[model samples]
Target: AAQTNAPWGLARISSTSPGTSTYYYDESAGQGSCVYVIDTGIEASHPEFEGRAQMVKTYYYSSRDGNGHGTHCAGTVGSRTYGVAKKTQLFGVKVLDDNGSGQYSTIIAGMDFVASDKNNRNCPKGVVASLSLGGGYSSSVNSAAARLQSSGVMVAVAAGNNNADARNYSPASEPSVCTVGASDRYDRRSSFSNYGSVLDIFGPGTDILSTWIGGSTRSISGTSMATPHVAGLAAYLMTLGKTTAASACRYIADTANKGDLSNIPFGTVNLLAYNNYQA
Candidate 1:
């Protein structure tokens, strides 16, 4: 069945908000650099991402919506917009099916695929992997994340939406992984966002607007939305020849807004400044 393109009320916030366009720019948009999104499959035919998404691989560990969650998250990260990184390529990996869940082994398999892409020459250079889902802290997952990072793949994951301290969750809690937290329109820590000393940074996630199942647009809220923001930004920075995940992460952390930290449990960490190679 062809999906409907219903407008999401939350999308209006993106247009009306100032910081919505502060992350990246279409003028400096990264070329269609390959990026793997490990989650549910995406709606490939959705206009926002019709030609943009490339299904490099698909896995069905759970018999759920194989592409729904991934597609929505992908749209948020690289959706063409005035200020967002528009031309980034997306690789959809359906680690979770309709049930919206998957085992750690499945997630690791997906990560391994991305990490091995370079050696296999399967994907283009400067590929970034985005993980919108993660579990509680696990040394195994952290080790895997480090391996992927060492292999030159930028791995970004959600800091979990449980709003618990950041000591929870596997990849998110791992210091080696670039864990992303959610922030509201006012730039405050989202009520549902998990926070901890491990949290690397924050992005627009609360009530985010993106393509949903069946080619529709909807406003969803979660740390999942925030993960892609970092992913997209990382891709964009890489396009500028800032290779390596460390360089990209540093760039974002340096440039991020960090005026008020009283509300946040930890003091603010700026990511945007890392982009300045000279600094």
Candidate 2:
């Protein structure tokens, strides 16, 4: 059976089609980049993952995605078929538990761990971390993301599910991180997505089909869902050798598919380079 157009996320970001030995994006896709889906945790044993994603670390809880959110988010970045950078090395750092509640200290600890492991060079291109969970605000989480950025890692976080300015959230409002919001295939802002200047980009998050717990796939919604789209793209960019977390961000902000997001202040971003983009 054919899967959801969630994989069409690649088309949304750039014109490059998948399953090809293209430059920049290789046939194996982001093989040398590592991504951390810091939500709950991934079901590393899932068939779709083919033994790629693992619970490399955890904070304050077991690294199991009992609620399925983390697994879904990870799939959007590296599930081999329904992913953005399909071949990137994958890991999950458990922060939010089954109930989706996490202590701010644990989130910061998770970031510190990723940066240390990545700086030691787990992947030749470095690492990128994705967080699809946020609520209220926390200076701790915010500063941690910036700290990770200093270590040369891209941190992509959700703009929250609230339809208000994301500046009210922690990681979403944090500087030097890719704060992502949710949008649909039409490139319209997700009705529940947070907007305003804090939002760095928009991605396919409405009724998205992705890997679930127990080797399943299901549809979910949230700015949380959109974070991985940016995460996956950030990994692809990091693997390019010339793009740092900040430079990758600048390029995406500069070359985003502004047309699909006519009011791009609250619309889509092309994380991938356009076909006519110069080398």
Candidate 3:
């Protein structure tokens, strides 16, 4: 099925709105890509996902997002209306508690699982691993994420909402990971978004509406809300043959709409992520 319209956040960043933008009308959307969500878990039955996703229960503690974070982030990453790449297949790998709490060891286990777990799904296309949760730095976890990156997997993680330097965080500060911060619909940094020289890029995170648990919808805000948008865009690029992390990241970094972002490190570029669909 083709996406008939652009998601509001995606459209706003791309400078398109409603019928004015034909970006979503394209058939080559995320058709052959897969996005893996590492969080509280997901409602595999969520209607917006249209029956696309493999629900994996991590060896670590997990649930169907009683905390509602995983499902929401997953919705933003791949749901039809709120996602960047609607045609991508999603895989839910639960790694946190319902309260969004987790240890680095468990999160790493989840990461390792996704790098190899197939669940019998036949997606020879590349995978984009989406992590919308982060905390204090941990070398062990960084090693796990780095290993995945070396194995040709693209990983996107939150830059944390602490409003401090993102370099102090775990996956966000990881040198090889695609670190993301939150940007408002108007292209300003989210008040709670972590920024600094470590930040890789920004995406829509303010009052984002996406799929929630129990077949519902919810609006939330955070750098957590921002990471999935990047993950989805990465997945879309993969479907088009930019399967490697280095290639896709280079394309996004080069093509991003450059601008000025205030109150962060002075040397950082305000390269806003954009995925404009055309007829």
Candidate 4:
């Protein structure tokens, strides 16, 4: 059966060079780089991901895709036809099993693998790790995040979707990790997005369109969806020599269009501005 009724169109051009037909094309051009999505295994068969994505590693810490959360997240970041880092390599780590849940121990094991991969030089050059899943903040996880940072890997994690004052979780709240918040199409802070001084940046998250299993697609909502947008954008910026997590983040913040920061908790940021700043 021919799949029909695609829900989400290409990511909206909230702010970009006026009169340009290509909205997110600046990030989609690859720029000869790679990013590792440390989450559920990707749906490798999705049409949007055709020849671009290469699964360099797979860690089924729990089980396989049950609710399909990981696949959806992966699609948001690596789905070739619609992703921000379409031309980059995707390394899937299934830390949260088929049940969409996992223990901190299991998740840490996966992170350790990525941290150690560089010693062997098995991972791609200039690799960035994007973790859209996280639990309550933990000292151990924070330590791990710091280790990964010291090792020269850019790590970005989701600022928990829970709309609460309390911090999100381990990897995200960790000082070393770049915690990302969610925003709507208008670039406003998502109602459900967790916020605090810990939050690093924001990305599009509301009703995001992404690939699902069995050649299907859907529009889902969560900070998980928003995390990848920044992750993909980070990969794009990295190609322009914005290598470290702090450097890439600074580029995004400094170049992002300044607006009414007093009105919003985190203010607004334009993805295209960051890309152009580095160019």
Candidate 5:
């Protein structure tokens, strides 16, 4: 037996309207790009990853994801069954711990590692860094994200889940990173998704299904879930020579579906993430 239809989130991105269940994608688009998932570590052995996901760096003592958050984010970015760029390489940068918590220093260290590693040519190809975690304002962390982008790594980070203005958070509020907010299957903003002018785009984040720890899968929601969808799209664009964060973000915004979201907050960008397809 085989999976017949695409998941709602995947199907939504490839279609003009929201009700369809088919996903049309270019299977070879992301083959030479890489996505760095920065969060709790990933379950690299998950069958859906097909050996593409690996823990390349960690600020903690161990590079294992007991929380299952990173694995899910990695799955959405590039797992075989649930990914956006199905052929992209997945690199896990373990910044948060098993509880999905981290100090500003630890997180900044992870960001620095990504910038340095990518600069050192550790990745097999160009990079798209997906950050699914954020906190209140931290100048150090924001600066780290800025430096990461300046190093030519396309960065995408989560707008916090506070249901308030995303301007109140760091990295998400950082001007250099592509900040993402969350929407549901009906094109409504998630109740807990942070918004406002800091957001660059919205993605299907409510109850999205993806790979989990123990080689399983789960449905979850948050701007955390939304951010990786954008990162995955960035990977696809990277192969087309949109190698820098600025260029990739611009392409994503220019091609995204405009005003397709409902219940959007004041000052928030109404752009919904799309993969430039229809099916």
Candidate 6:
């Protein structure tokens, strides 16, 4: 009934105890939900994804991922090996480039595409937008993120890796977004994760292993890695009827393991993401 030798990031979220490395999950994990990974792009052919990952929209390149960021985030969101929601439909909405850089105009265009896609189709029961990208405060970016939320897409954005206040960043600083910070395997705040009152929650970010380019795997760290875990969980919660962005974000905060993380700076919430698979 549980998965052994799972990635620590996945194991950590499902367990009530800090050191446990086994993962327990429901069979319906992301069964009726969809998660859009808006980043560089994804290696949709990666075996870890079980052919469920695809590049639906692109602003920089085709389905090919010269940059490995989006594929890794996709694995954490829905890959068979490292995913939080394995059965969910995974779509790659590319905005960034192989160098992991994109302009606000391009990024906003990607968000608008997701909003339009949400409105134009009969998608899954719930939808989530996983953004592992952010920059300095930009009202346009914030408004775009808010508009995505208003369009009924649950957004989980990275509290940038600058180790500064997330309030200084766009998208993450947006009040309507569920901005996520990073934690480590030891239940402590990640040294590089941005903090402050704007962060809505924390997820495992350090030494995270997931799908990468060329049908392989890699381990990396950042609030970028942390955001998808929350996004996947948000999609999972949506399948359980927390469909709205507001309700999904609220449920995540309420069900999170509060005051469990250490070394948090002042004003940052000490809530660690959890999926109720305690052991």
Query: Considering TM-score, where higher is better, how would the candidates rank from best to worst?
Result: 6, 5, 3, 2, 1, 4
Q: Model-by-model lDDT, in order?
A: 0.66, 0.75, 0.77, 0.64, 0.86, 0.89
Cα lDDT tens digits for candidate 5, 175-270: 878999999999999889998888888888999899999999999998999998899988876765644555888788888999888888667899
Residue pairs with backbone atoms closer than 3 Å in model 5 (clashes): none
- For model 6, give the 10-residue run with minimal summed lDDT: 118-127
Q: Pick the winner on lDDT between candidates 1 and 5.
A: 5
Q: TM per model? A: 0.83, 0.87, 0.91, 0.82, 0.95, 0.97
RMSD (Cα, Å) for all candidates, in order, is 5.6, 4.2, 2.6, 4.8, 2.1, 1.3
For candidate 6, give the lDDT.
0.89
The 10-residue segment with the lowest total lDDT in model 1: 1-10
Clash pairs, candidate 2, are: none
Q: Give the TM-score of candidate 6.
A: 0.97
Q: Give the per-residue lDDT of model 3 (tens digit) for 120-199.
A: 55556677888998789888888888877776678888989898888788888887888888877656788898887777
What is the Å distance of residue 56 in model 2 from its true position?
1.3
- What is the C-alpha lDDT profile of model 6 across 119-167, one tens digit per residue? 6544567889999999999999999999999888999999999989988
- Tens-digit per-residue lDDT, 200-276, candidate 2: 67776777778999889988889887888888887876676657676776666676655554334433343322322
In Å, residue 112's CA in model 1 sits off its true spot by 0.4
4 versus 5: better lDDT goes to = 5
lDDT computed for candidate 4: 0.64
